[PDB]
């Protein structure tokens, strides 16, 4: 199973590159594994922009 | 597996130059921002509706790639549902632009100077960085060379 | 900040955890023991070490305060001798185990306001801090602690009282069940010292099955799941077969003979007594908590059982942190550090204007 | 609304099926409609009216071609419509006779003698 | 300063003659498609010069600007001028003028400026062969 | 620096490493002509030149050390200034060290896998021996020429590739 | 308002004139689907490009029938 999800993740990198996302490899891995568990992804799209903003307020 | 990758995410947002308590405070602000919003149509069609928005503003082959890959990715949808909303949070010649000399293609095209004029912009986009550098090295050093004495660089503030 | 600092004390059953808000671990650790003639005013190393000739008791060991003198005494010695701090410079956040009575919280605020004279106060509940540590505020939490178990649904940020199910399970009955199986098997065990040695091995060496059927099959072909432990204390006690069977008895209670309902049926009934439109969203956040942190090998079994329970018309999402032991602590340490949370922290003025029992109602 | 969801409203209007049934057609529709959102030819509504006239002569109804002039008047009378060319060209493209040479006669200028 | 800029002008003024001359039927058939691929990099050099002259109208171009702008072209067009004078000096057509490209794609491989040009000229020149 | 990057660009006998060192020197040269481009239109030149008095001073030492140097002797004349403890000088010398390092690793893609050997221009360490191919092509055909061993590699990296 | 409804009355007229022209050309579009196509025509559209899709989905409303 781990061979399949790795290949699908490698394909998921290129389409998140041309769609101009804020993701790099680490937040792609955490958020794809989070989506695999299954919750509404429309709220995850807001929590990610909040996490980066709330770290940026410290800097 | 999510609980180790959220730890790696908190490792990256920590600047690595102590620094074993700051990670946990970044974890505090991380959970404190995670539960804020939680307090208060197919997958691939969302890609199709934006591939149309791609095609209107030029750049045909990018939409041609975007639609074929999600076709074989549906032959995981929650990831694309995550991606259609993160598509605006990103960053803020060779030998083929107007090559009409070599090739087994027919040379038969009329003039409009709006294929060549965005071939003058393909050069000017290199030049518009390489000209802003010439402006932004003298202003960046004249804003630091001139100040008040004693507050001119913070290393005298030690 | 430059304001007067806050304080968090989680008075547990195994140990007492005190600390200042926004710290990594609790800043200072005591035993929960209150020694009396079986010192009389001391808790510490001497009180735990002299526990053979002094009384061995903890104020919460059942989900509710068993002895009140015990509670006031452990709270006074941890506030006065460990921290060395005075109440006028420290508003304190208290914690209670799930389904602690409103009148007990009234009595608690009253005694803390008169014999202790706190300037401001907060009393919380256990499972909400556990979920706040797990980074959500709406979900279902299955908390089986050290005296008490509850399947708490929580939606909008506070628990639903029609739908919170009380269950009689603790880690105490697990260590008790280890005592029962060794004494029925024919091995001498009735003593406190060997209870602490089996508690230490239950915390550290334990490993728990993925299934009821498969690990009995592998032990039935020929048994080998033994992780050999020779302790430096001098005793040699380890059997690999018994320890994956010890917490497994919650899956089928008639293994032990336990009066309490099975875990699968309790979760199903807890989702059944919640609202039907909010049903899917509440079951998409299942949380690890409490004294059942003996080994995280049960967590995989728990996720498997919840996958087997759930249909395709509902969602699962089980958050699986190894932050499950100190979860109650780190919740309160998150909350009282913030300055915007002061709007839900009750003062002296409002406590005088709206009575003692309003701490039950303002807490959310 | 926004145009991208309006395409989806189209694909639910014409088909009796929802978008969950078939999504090959909506992808092929995205391939057609995209990069065609701007008229790169002249938008004279006069030529488009004189093409409906030729169309109704080709269907042998001169009374319909002569009521068409009153209906073409009514657009001038209100004048609130912005591109009169597009909607009549759309209704002309879906022409149907309730009961050959058409590219040889009048069409709008290509703009190959002008910068597009 | 203008003496220093003269090499890229010299490797233009002697390459377009080659492009015109070796497109006649008396010059092999691979030697045609070699010179036909020397026009992709002459388009860039012409459009650059035009862009600088249109900047000059508003008052936004000087000589030092041109001198730092032309630094990659001074290499790339010079390689083409050497190829042109080597084809003219001998009698290289066919596989022999396809020998020179396959050799020059090796004689600088560490540069990745004098590899990439020849690595395209190879695939473009050898369409007939 | 303006003389050096022009003289070795009309010399195609400066090899596959030197024609990359000069290409890096062109881009370094480009910035001090950005300065001379802006300065004539404005016509102090004291305040403005304090920071180019340091960078160009370093660039002259880089040029003077690397006069007539190519091959593995340019792998120890540009890497000889990256061993400094200042990240500012590390960042300055990089974009020159990368461009000199790429020919060395281009020769090592044709001698870690099959390709063309490099000692027609002596910038690699292998000195091959012609007409010995009966059985000594597994023992003695490849002398390790010490003068072109790169000093950003050790012996275990500049041999066991052989 | 009221002046925003007199304009919309003058738009309702125009839409009925385009409705006559729609029915004598016998388009399969009814009053609802045509109201999507007029909103498309407001934003700018190439109706040769819309017509090629509508001539296929109308033949593919009967292909899976």
TrEMBL record, chain C:
Molecular-function GO terms, alphabetical: ATP binding
**Cellular compartments annotated:** Cytoplasm, Cytoskeleton
* Chief localisation class: cytoplasm
What GO cellular component entries does it have? cytoskeleton
Record keyword ATP-binding present: yes
Please indicate if the UniProt record lists Ion transport as a keyword.
Answer: no
Q: Which SMART domains match?
A: ACTIN
| Stored InterPro entries | Actin (IPR004000), Actin/actin-like_CS (IPR020902), Actin_CS (IPR004001), ATPase_NBD (IPR043129)
Q: Which UniProt keywords apply?
A: ATP-binding, Cytoplasm, Cytoskeleton, Nucleotide-binding, Oxidation
Please indicate which superkingdom the organism of origin belongs to.
Answer: Eukaryota
**Family that this chain belongs to:** Belongs to the actin family.
What protein name is recorded for this chain?
Answer: Actin, cytoplasmic 1
Species of the source = Geospiza fortis
Protein encoded by which gene: ACTB
């Amino acid at each position: 199973n781990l061979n399949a999800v790795r290949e699908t993740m490698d394909v998921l990198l290129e389409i998140s590159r041309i769609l101009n996302t804020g993701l790099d490899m680490e937040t792609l891995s955490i958020c794809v594994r989070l989506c695999e568990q299954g919750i509404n992804p429309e709220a995850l799209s807001s929590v990610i922009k909040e996490l980066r903003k709330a770290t940026e307020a410290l800097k | 597996s999510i609980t180790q990758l959220f730890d790696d995410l908190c490792e990256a947002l920590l600047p690595a130059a102590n620094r074993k308590r700051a990670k946990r405070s970044l974890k505090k602000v991380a959970y404190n921002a995670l539960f804020t919003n939680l307090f208060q149509l197919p997958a691939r069609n969302k890609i199709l509706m934006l591939s149309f928005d791609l095609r209107v503003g030029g750049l045909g082959p990018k939409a041609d790639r975007l639609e074929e890959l999600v076709e074989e990715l549906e032959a995981v949808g929650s990831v694309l549902d995550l991606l259609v909303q993160l598509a605006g949070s990103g960053p803020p010649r060779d030998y083929f632009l107007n090559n009409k000399h070599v090739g087994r293609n027919v040379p038969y095209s009329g003039y409009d100077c709006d294929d060549l004029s965005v071939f003058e912009m393909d050069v000017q986009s290199l030049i518009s960085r390489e000209e802003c550098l010439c402006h932004s090295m003298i202003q960046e050093t004249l804003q630091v060379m001139e100040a008040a004495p004693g507050t001119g660089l913070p290393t005298v503030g030690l | 900040d430059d304001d007067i600092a806050a304080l968090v004390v989680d008075n547990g059953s195994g140990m007492c955890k005190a600390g200042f808000a926004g710290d990594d671990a609790p800043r200072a650790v005591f035993p929960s023991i209150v020694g009396r003639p079986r010192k009389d005013s001391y808790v510490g190393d001497e009180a735990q070490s002299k526990r053979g000739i002094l009384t061995l008791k903890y104020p919460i060991e059942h989900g509710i305060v068993t002895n009140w003198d015990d509670m006031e005494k452990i709270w006074h010695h941890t506030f006065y001798n460990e921290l060395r701090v005075a109440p006028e410079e420290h508003p304190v956040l208290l914690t209670e185990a799930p389904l602690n009575p409103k009148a007990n919280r009234e009595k608690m605020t009253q005694i803390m306001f008169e014999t202790f004279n706190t300037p401001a106060m907060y009393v919380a509940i256990q499972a909400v801090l556990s979920l706040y540590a797990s980074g959500r505020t709406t979900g279902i939490v299955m908390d089986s602690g050290d005296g008490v178990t509850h399947t708490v649904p929580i939606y909008e940020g506070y628990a639903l009282p029609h739908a919170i199910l009380r269950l009689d399970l603790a880690g105490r009955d697990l260590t008790d069940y280890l005592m029962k199986i060794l004494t029925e098997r024919g091995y001498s065990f009735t003593t406190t010292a060997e209870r602490e040695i089996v508690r230490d091995i239950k915390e550290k060496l334990c490993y728990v099955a993925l299934d009821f059927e498969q690990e009995m099959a592998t032990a039935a072909s020929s048994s080998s799941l033994e992780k050999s432990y020779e302790l430096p204390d001098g005793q040699v006690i380890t059997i690999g077969n018994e320890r994956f069977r010890c917490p497994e008895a919650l899956f089928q209670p008639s293994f032990l003979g336990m009066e309490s309902c099975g875990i699968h049926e309790t979760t199903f009934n807890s989702i059944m007594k919640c609202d039907v439109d909010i049903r899917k969203d509440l079951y998409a956040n299942t949380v690890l908590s409490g004294g059942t942190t003996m080994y995280p090998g049960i967590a995989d079994r728990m996720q498997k059982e919840i996958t087997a329970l759930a249909p395709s018309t509902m969602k699962i999402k089980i958050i699986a942190p190894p932050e499950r032991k100190y979860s109650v602590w780190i919740g309160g340490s998150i909350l009282a550090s913030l300055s915007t949370f002061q709007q839900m922290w009750i003062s002296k003025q409002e406590y005088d204007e709206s009575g003692p029992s309003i701490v039950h109602r303002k807490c959310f | 609304k926004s145009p991208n969801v309006l395409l989806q409203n189209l694909c639910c209007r014409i088909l009796g099926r929802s978008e969950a049934d078939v999504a090959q057609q909506f992808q092929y529709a995205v391939r057609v409609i995209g990069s065609n959102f701007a008229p790169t030819v002249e938008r004279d509504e006069f030529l488009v009216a004189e093409k409906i006239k030729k169309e109704l002569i080709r269907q042998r109804r001169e009374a319909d071609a002569a009521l068409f002039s009153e209906l073409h008047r009514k657009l001038h009378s209100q004048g609130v419509l912005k591109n009169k060319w597009s909607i009549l060209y759309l209704l002309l493209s879906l022409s149907e006779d309730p009961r050959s040479y058409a590219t040889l006669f009048a069409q709008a200028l290509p703009r190959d003698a002008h910068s597009t | 300063l203008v003496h220093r800029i003269l090499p890229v002008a010299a490797s233009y003024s002697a390459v377009t003659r080659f492009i015109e001359e070796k497109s006649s039927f008396e010059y092999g058939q691979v030697n045609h498609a070699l010179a036909a691929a020397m026009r992709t990099l002459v388009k860039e050099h012409l459009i650059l010069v035009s862009q600088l002259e249109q900047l000059h109208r508003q008052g936004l171009l000087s000589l030092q600007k041109l001198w730092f702008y032309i630094q990659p072209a001074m290499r790339t067009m010079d390689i083409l001028a050497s190829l042109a004078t080597s084809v003219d000096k001998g009698e290289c057509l066919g596989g022999s003028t396809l020998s020179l490209l396959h050799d020059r794609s090796f004689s600088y491989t560490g540069d990745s400026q004098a590899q990439e040009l020849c690595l395209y000229l190879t695939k473009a020149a050898s369409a007939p062969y | 620096i303006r003389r050096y990057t022009d003289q070795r660009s009309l010399d195609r006998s400066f090899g596959l490493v030197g024609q990359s060192f000069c290409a890096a020197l062109h881009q370094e040269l480009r910035e001090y002509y950005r300065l001379l481009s802006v300065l004539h239109s404005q016509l102090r030149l004291l305040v403005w030149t304090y920071d180019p008095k340091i960078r160009l001073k370093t660039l002259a030492a880089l040029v003077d050390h690397c006069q007539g140097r190519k091959g593995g002797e340019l792998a120890s004349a540009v890497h000889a200034y990256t061993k400094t403890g200042d990240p500012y000088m590390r960042s300055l010398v990089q974009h020159i060290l990368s461009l000199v390092s790429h020919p060395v690793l281009s020769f090592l893609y044709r001698w870690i896998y099959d390709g063309e050997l490099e000692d027609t221009y002596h910038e690699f360490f292998v000195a091959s021996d012609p007409t010995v191919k009966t059985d000594r092509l597994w023992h003695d055909k490849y002398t390790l020429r010490k003068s072109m061993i790169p000093s950003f590699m050790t012996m275990d990296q500049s041999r066991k590739v052989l």
